[PDB]
Write a protein that binds this ligand. Structure first.
Ligand code: HEM
Ligand code: CN5
Lengths: 431, 55
């Protein structure tokens, strides 16, 4: 259980697992939706779908190869999967169809067919997926006029004016050897992957990606998208949090785990050791909530999201939740900290030790692109067990107590009160 | 008057009533507020205010 990195001008990372039955090989780039502008937003989402189109997936299926891809704000992925004794064929396909030749993929017929499907994907998302479009709107009001505001799928208006030239320009600027990591997970040995690469030569482009003029900045604000015909209210609320490669990275994750997640219709979720639940269940002000701590290269967010059918008691839900947050500065106990320690270990122990090599490749490539190295799971546990009550109170006194907030909501949100009555609940007065 | 002109009985009864009526005005001010709570307040435009409210 250890990763091995080498460099030849090309970075090559690998987590070998001898007891698996598959192998994944791919390339991860260090540019995401936070590396484009409002005019070409969605060009990366359209690159993913050109990779996964028919005539490229057909050519892989005849050889016994499956394909995958993912767009995020800091990185992109293009992965190939196979049986363990078929990994050299995986690398060849990744060489031919992607890095060297792509005139086959950017044809006039394949481009229009791909654009039609992607527009239908995005239009469907904006009309039916309410919890996820409110979290995207939160990012856009918190980081307005800054690169961390742009949605990852793109916007239906900017996505309509794209041509092949926009794709080719974006490729020449960001798909570069200086901005790339080659990964390998599952039943694959490091030496074999290194040997297969030097037998070929395998370089995409040289480097010099553009530098981004503006840095990300948090701004307290709100955006309300009112729709009285929907049957619920969906709300998300956050403060500024921690970026990746921060000293307070695990302390913010432990603090989110203290308040946790809830489903009203599951019996065992009603019995969790969370003091907020003693307040909501007597009048049943929500159906579910979840606390998050999101982290990027430049900034982060810390907060919660909720959905509810009780549209006359929204003000009681927001009030009781924000008063529990205040206790992290004043009166958090030792039992609440020892519970969140061991449940945080179970959480990220399941994220980093699933059975899917595709998830391993995305995690590994994103971490090595920032830190140059991966922190093992035995090391992360020791940092978590060394946190005390004093560290939590010091973090909360700086990040939560009387600080500005960002809010987004949709649906039946008449009962959501104004900004300054919610902002005033971030301090107590009775300390 | 209490007599045949404005005199002593007039001035002593006018002071006892003058202390009383302020407490009757206060009871009418409570009934006045109850009638406002039903429909709330109007606004300078003369149209409905149920679409945009502030606490
Ligand atoms: C001791 C005397 C009074 C007190 C304490 C009082 C109190 C109030 C208060 C607090 C309001 C709330 C809205 C506003 O300020 O406009 C109000 C509204 C109102 N008052 Fe009075 N009031 C008094 C006398 C009167 C009188 C003498 C009249 C008329 C002859 C009157 C007619 C009204 C009306 C029509 C409104 C509603 C106005 C609107 O909503 O557009 N009140 N009153
Ligand atoms: C048919 C047979 C009949 C024979 C018997 C004869 C008896 C006849 C008289 C019966 C007695 C009257 C009935 C009792 C009654 O209406 O009041 C007693 C109940 C309590 O009064 P309340 O109206 O709830 O308080 C009044 C409240 O409901 C209203 O509150 P509000 O004052 O509008 O708020 C303003 C406060 C704002 O706060 C501040 C000032 O900052």
């Amino acid at each position: 259980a250890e990763v091995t990195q080498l460099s030849n001008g090309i970075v090559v990372a690998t987590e070998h697992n001898p007891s698996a039955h598959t192998a994944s090989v791919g390339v991860v780039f260090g540019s995401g939706a936070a590396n484009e502008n409002p005019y070409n937003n969605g060009v990366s989402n359209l690159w993913k779908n050109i990779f996964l189109s028919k005539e490229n997936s057909a050519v892989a299926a005849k050889e016994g190869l499956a394909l995958s891809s993912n767009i995020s704000r800091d990185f992109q992925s293009y992965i190939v999967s196979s049986l363990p004794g078929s990994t050299d064929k995986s690398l060849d396909f990744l060489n031919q169809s992607f890095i060297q030749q792509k005139a086959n993929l950017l044809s006039s017929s394949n481009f229009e067919a791909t654009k039609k499907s992607v527009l239908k994907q995005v239009q469907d998302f904006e009309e039916n997926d309410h919890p996820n479009r409110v979290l995207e709107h939160l990012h856009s009001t918190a980081f307005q006029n800054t690169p961390l505001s742009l949605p990852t799928r793109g916007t239906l208006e900017s996505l309509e004016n794209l041509v092949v030239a926009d794709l080719e320009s974006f490729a020449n600027n960001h798909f570069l050897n200086s901005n790339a990591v080659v990964v390998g997970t599952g039943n694959i040995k490091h030496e074999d992957l290194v040997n297969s690469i030097e037998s070929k030569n395998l370089s995409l482009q040289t480097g010099t990606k553009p530098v981004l003029k503006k840095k990300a900045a948090f701004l307290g604000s709100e955006v309300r998208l009112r729709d009285d015909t929907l049957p619920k209210a969906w709300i998300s609320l956050a403060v500024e949090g921690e970026p990746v490669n921060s000293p307070n990275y695990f302390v913010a994750k432990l603090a989110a785990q203290i308040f946790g997640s809830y489903n009203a219709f599951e019996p065992a979720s009603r019995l969790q050791g969370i003091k907020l639940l003693d307040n909501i269940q007597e009048y049943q002000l929500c159906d579910n909530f979840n606390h998050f701590s999101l982290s990027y290269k430049d900034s982060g967010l810390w907060g919660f999201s909720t959905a509810t059918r009780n549209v006359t008691m929204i003000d009681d839900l927001i009030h009781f939740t924000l008063k529990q947050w205040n206790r992290l500065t004043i009166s958090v106990t030792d039992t609440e900290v020892e519970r969140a320690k061991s449940l945080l270990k179970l959480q990220l122990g399941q994220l980093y030790e699933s059975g899917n090599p595709v998830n391993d490749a995305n995690l590994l490539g994103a971490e090595v692109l920032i830190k140059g190295s991966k922190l093992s799971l035995g090391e992360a546990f020791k940092k978590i067990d060394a946190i005390t009550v004093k560290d939590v109170k010091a973090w909360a006194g700086k990040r939560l107590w009387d600080q500005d907030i960002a809010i987004a909501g949709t649906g039946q949100i008449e009962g959501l009160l104004d900004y300054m009555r919610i902002r005033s609940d971030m301090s107590m007065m009775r300390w | 008057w209490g007599g045949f002109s404005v005199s002593n009985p007039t001035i002593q009864r006018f002071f006892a009533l003058h202390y009383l009526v302020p407490f009757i005005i206060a009871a009418m001010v409570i009934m006045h507020l109850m009638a406002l709570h039903i429909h709330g307040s109007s606004n300078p435009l003369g149209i409905t205010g149920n679409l945009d409210r502030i606490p």
